[PDB]
Amino acid sequence: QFNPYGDNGGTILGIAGEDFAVLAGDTRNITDYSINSRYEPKVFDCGDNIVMSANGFAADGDALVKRFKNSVKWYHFDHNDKKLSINSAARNIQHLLYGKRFFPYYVHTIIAGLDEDGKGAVYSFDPVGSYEREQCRAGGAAASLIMPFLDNQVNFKNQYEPGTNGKVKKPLKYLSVEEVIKLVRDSFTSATERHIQVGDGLEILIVTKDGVRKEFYELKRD
Amino acid sequence: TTLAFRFQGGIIVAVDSRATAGNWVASQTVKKVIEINPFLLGTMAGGAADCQFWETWLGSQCRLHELREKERISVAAASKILSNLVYQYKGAGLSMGTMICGYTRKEGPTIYYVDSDGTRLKGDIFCVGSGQTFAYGVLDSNYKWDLSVEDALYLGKRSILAAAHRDAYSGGSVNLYHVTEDGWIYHGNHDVGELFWKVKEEEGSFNNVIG
């Protein structure tokens, strides 16, 4: 019997700073044990300082990103070129996803940008459109490898202040864009070593008030 | 794990913040209470999207009622809008455990249990979710109608904590609400990590744990 779903692998990572946000993804596209492409981007500038990635079944992911980009275009037409705030984009994507509640998009969606106070924002969605604002989120194949590391190094979970008998927690603070990109690069090199579907290349889209910048880094090709 | 109970001082609503995908802990920072309007609350249990989408939709339907009738919607009417909606979708696979809690002058403090089977129940005490059994055990044992607001708030917090510990699919943090004649009031987010040890030390319970 025809199975309408497939797994194209790949893993994505969103991190929110004070006055910036990053959305990273590996560039490897796979089927079963075959490599389809070593460079197939799945992190996209959607306009209005919103970056998006729909990781999982690539066909459903391409369809959703295409539909959201179109949603941004028609929001401009219908509301006098008004800028689509990241919170408004997040609610719109819930409706896009829940629209297919009984034939879902098999993707894990992350969008990143700035909120209306200019502070770094990351939203994550399940396949049927349940969403939540987060400082930190990994999605896809190697999410289980990356996410506990981010808990430890970003949110400083389980780290206590030396000498305080484990009574005073290590204080939360915003990381620089430089310090965040280090954690992203190390997160993906680690995931590349231990997950067969992760490797080839890492593409990071950084979002500031100045716009959307790209950085590319090689990963192991085995 | 979600609970809501009626007492002399109004309604206590307590929920956890854990979202799971199988045995994977997806999040510990989820808001399982929807604020609908200043006198109405919605609790969510089951499919995250199903609860989140339809209870957000319920808030829109409640706003329209108040615009068309120049009067805030009743808890009975609000609960039946949601229960009539899920009944339409019955058999399609919606998964939702829900409690609509609010005060109106004509009804007083009211709690309605509503689930995706189409069951709509009015009651004084409800516990919904995987950890409902753990919450019930603590709540039923120490529930009194004439509990003080401070004691009622603690019992709701304590009942979620009990469930968070014993239940694998409950945890993260406890979110507390109090509903009176003047509306609902947020009583903060209590991380279970810090709360558990404080409760153990102060109450002298959790003797099964080492430490």
Partner: peptide
């Protein structure tokens, strides 16, 4: 997968 207390 989807999220599910």
């Amino acid at each position: 997968x989807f999220l599910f207390x």
